[model samples]
Target: EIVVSKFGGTSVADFDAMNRSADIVLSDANVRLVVLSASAGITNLLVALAEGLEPGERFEKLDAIRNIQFAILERLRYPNVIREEIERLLENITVLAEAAALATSPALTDELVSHGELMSTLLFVEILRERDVQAQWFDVRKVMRTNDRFGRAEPDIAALAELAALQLLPRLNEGLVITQGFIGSENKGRTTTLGRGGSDYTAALLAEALHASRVDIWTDVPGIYTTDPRVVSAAKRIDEIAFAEAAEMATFGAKVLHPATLLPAVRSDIPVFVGSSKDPRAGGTLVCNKTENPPLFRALALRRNQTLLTLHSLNMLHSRGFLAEVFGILARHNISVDLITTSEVSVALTLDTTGSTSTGDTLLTQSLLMELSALCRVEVEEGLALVALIGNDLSKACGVGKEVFGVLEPFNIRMICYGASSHNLCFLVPGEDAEQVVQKLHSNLFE
Candidate 1:
């Protein structure tokens, strides 16, 4: 009856939050393993220290690094073991500093970039031991294997599972284990990352490895909501959703969970729960094999920072493989299409835009644009967001598309995408129009 609970950064944002989180470890029986993200916003800052180039001096980066270590040191009230682990990690940082003295590249950038996870896990384990929990620091680096895809390394399942059978199972069967997520080992034993918010993927991977009973993703939200609260005030909550429905929600930018988090767990048929750091009592989103559940709206999620690319056929009204040709190009560029609205004259796809190295900066690659153009005329719209309403039966279901547009009429939404599957209805609004669109849609749909 073991449960694998994953805590996001905000859950342990500070000493106060960590103290609250510590109680969660002891509150319930059978909650054996706790997988943690770094403190809220800490990883981003740490990653910036290494990858982001500041104009003048490295002193600011040094200060930022020390401040992070200082907070961990400041937080420990018991468990004398943490101080010693802190000292060891500091030495590793020293080695990293020395290493930084010689190299420059995104590869080396990732070296200093990945320290937050290891540091957080170290601190978390020590803090737990203070509460008399017999938790041991288990480095995910010991198991999760990946290719040399530095920033977004793909998981090597065969290697990962083999190591876990030998290492992870025994530990989980007997004692509590603490491990970092979102980071893994690359070739030559270099530390590589699996992209940000990848910690959820990490938990799923580990669950698959140990064949655990359950994986709980603990975040700041109470549960999967009808829409992002920041956007939709009238948002309702979903008690349950199917695996495919949840995956489509994630793909469409619900932001409730990472899209990659579902695959392994879905394959293993492991039960996944998305609940809250605030209210653990609430029954969260349960994703598993179906067992005669009533149909209901899972949730509505909005994705901002989206870029819309409309590809039109040059031969208008007739062409072979035009759809496939455009999608093929997107796949090659590692770009996933989130929404599409097509007509006799053209084809359009909206891409989920990622964060910039620095905001106010344009990161779209010209080659991506060129590839789209190779197939047809391509149009670009920056500063747009996607309002995706996800449910099991949402495909043009009962004038759902009209209902969405009716709500968004005030927001001046830029685009609309209707899915062939009965899962999601997406509307593209001006990025600035996100909040208005969300509020309006939620009021109309939920209230």
Candidate 2:
């Protein structure tokens, strides 16, 4: 059986961390494929450089990236073996940054930021080699095919499967393979990224293509928690989670796994294990098709920076195409609506502003509002948070709303969306009061 393991930024942040990750890979012979994110703090510097920095600021950011890489390089046992390749990658980044400083575009930005993963994987391969493991550095862009969306490209699954079968499968048979995550190539050979926090998705996609038995995501946390521990001190780590509930938590803003990471795994019926590279022995969460005796209230997830849009139109009381017209306008603007509820003459919905190229304020542009106003009265409210309770049979579960709403009565809930999915019950609360609400709910429910 094959196992695909992925390490997050902090897992490969420096020499010691990389060594720990390499040891983890060596611990299991089934772990043949390894995916890695850029080292901690490197992506941020690269992003700053990609945003058209001044020459002086550009030099500073580039130096920061170089320093982070070289710090690990200098500590390597066989630094000479990969030094030239590292220097070459750095030079290429310098050129890209210079060009971006002159004229920045989304394509240029992806090209520039991609160097982070490229350099990290290179360093990782050497780390494995030093341990006497036969490690091969594989370029993921060669097999991972995606559309030309530049910053947030969607993977072409059929193409990806064919390419992996032709190119990657053979390499896996020879030795341990290490590849960069969060990056792929478009049909034109231009480097495209899958947006921020996409490394987990990359691992799952590769696992699905190869028909692997499982995918392990190693992050800073040990596992999925009942709530953000920072907000609620009593938050406990869950041992097992159902795929549907985990998907809901991830979608509503659980940070343990990327929101899209579960898609390929779920599609292939492959179980996912999420744990900490720093403390792998501490146990972790397993997400599978089913769990034993799933609870009615398993976890709570909080998504901040939410924008609520309410539309009022008297025509909606008896109109046929009013709803279609409103949604069509949003679709044209590429705005994604997260939750919605409608009454006699009004419809209220929350805009999914996270993970998009645009922020909440910039998402509802004047043009979009103007078009929306032509159909109905448009009101946009920001600084709200979506708090979701992820569990089993939530809508049919007895006393869920009574208990949830009883605790949340002290705060103002802008909207409530429930009875749609049995996995979750979500509501909007003031951003400032989100943490307190979560703490109160956790105390009442879990404590």
Candidate 3:
């Protein structure tokens, strides 16, 4: 049984966490490939560096990055292999930093942040070898093929599978293989990245291609919760769930897993487990084809930094192409809508802030606004939140909407988007009211 284990930032956060992950590797000789994300806080800091790159500022952040890698090496006694890898990555970042400083584009940003995973994976492989395991460093960039979409590159399935069959299979048959996650290459070998939280998606992609027996996502949390444990103390861990439920929770901002993580796995009928690298014995959630006797209120998700755009036009009341044209415009602009609600002549929708950058912040630009203004009376609202309650067959439950709104009455409701997905009941609310809304809904529904 070949097991593909993916360790998130927290799982590989430090020397101690890496030690735990090493145990996981030894515990199962069948665990063939290990995928690693940037160490704790490294990805975020890298993003900050990309966002704030000037001449002096770039040098300062580069020094800080250099210090971070050295600090980790220092704790591990600075193995020669790890040190060399870190140096090479630093050199790459230096070049990319100069390039990014010139133009500050999405492709440059992808190049800038790929260093985090490269550095982390290098250190982790050294850590594994220290534990007396036969670990080899595998560069995913040589195998994973994506379009030239840069910051949010979509994988070319046939190309990636072919590469894996030739490149990854032979290597994995020998011993444990370690690789970077969330980073890939586009045409002509230019650096690209999967979107935010894409490391998990990368793992799933590898799992599907390699036909692994199972894929485990090791995170800080033990399992999927009824709600965010930080916000609701009564939040309980779900032992098992169906793919649909888990995907909905992730899509609506549950944050335990990436929404795209299970796509390939679900299609291939591969079983996935979510466990804690910190405490592997605590167990975790299992996501597969279906769950027996699934709960009604499976989970809740809250997404922040959301912007709502509402377009009203009398021309749309009976027009055939209005909805299609609007959606087509959004597609051409590459703006992904989270929740959309439409009335007779008015349409309202939510777009996550993070989705705009790949197109160079194309959402509210003059041309986009102009296109929208020509269509109707346009309104833009920022600082909003999308709260989602995930369950089984929610659209069939007539009173479920009433029950949700009853709990939300304390705060002003912005918009209700239900029935679009049978597993989700999502609504828009004031960003300030998100926490209260979550707490109140959990108490009323779960407690």
Clash number for each model: 1, 0, 0
lDDT of 3: 0.83
Q: Tens digit of lDDT per residue, candidate 1, span 352-436?
A: 7542112223335788776556657878787887877766666535776576776555667677666677877777778887777
Instruction: Give residue 213's error in model 1 in angstroms.
Output: 1.5
Report the C-alpha lDDT of model 2 over 189-226, residue by residue, as the tens digit.
Answer: 99898877889889999999999999999988888899
lDDT tens digits, residue span 1-447, model 3: 688989998888778888888888788777899999988877776776666577787787788778777766877754676777688888878877776666687877888888898888888888877767788999999899999987778888888899998999999988889998898999899989997788988999999999899998999989888988888889888898989888888888878787788888888888889888999889898999988998778878988878889888747434467777887888887777778888866888787766312434445777887887888789999889889999988888768967788877678888888877888888888899898899888888888
Those runs of model 2 whose alpha carbons end farther than 4 Å from true positions after fitting are 314-318, 356-362
Off by over 4 Å in 1: 55-58, 75-81, 84-104, 291-296, 313-318, 321-324, 354-364, 371-375
Best by TM-score: 2
Q: Is candidate 1 or candidate 2 better by lDDT?
A: 2
TM-score of each: 0.87, 0.96, 0.95
Residue 101 error for model 3, in Å?
2.6
Evaluate all candidate structures by whole-model CA lDDT and list the values in order. Answer: 0.72, 0.87, 0.83
Q: What lDDT, from 0 to 1, does candidate 2 have? A: 0.87
Order of the predicted models by lDDT, top scorer first: 2, 3, 1
Candidate 1 local distance difference test against the native: 0.72
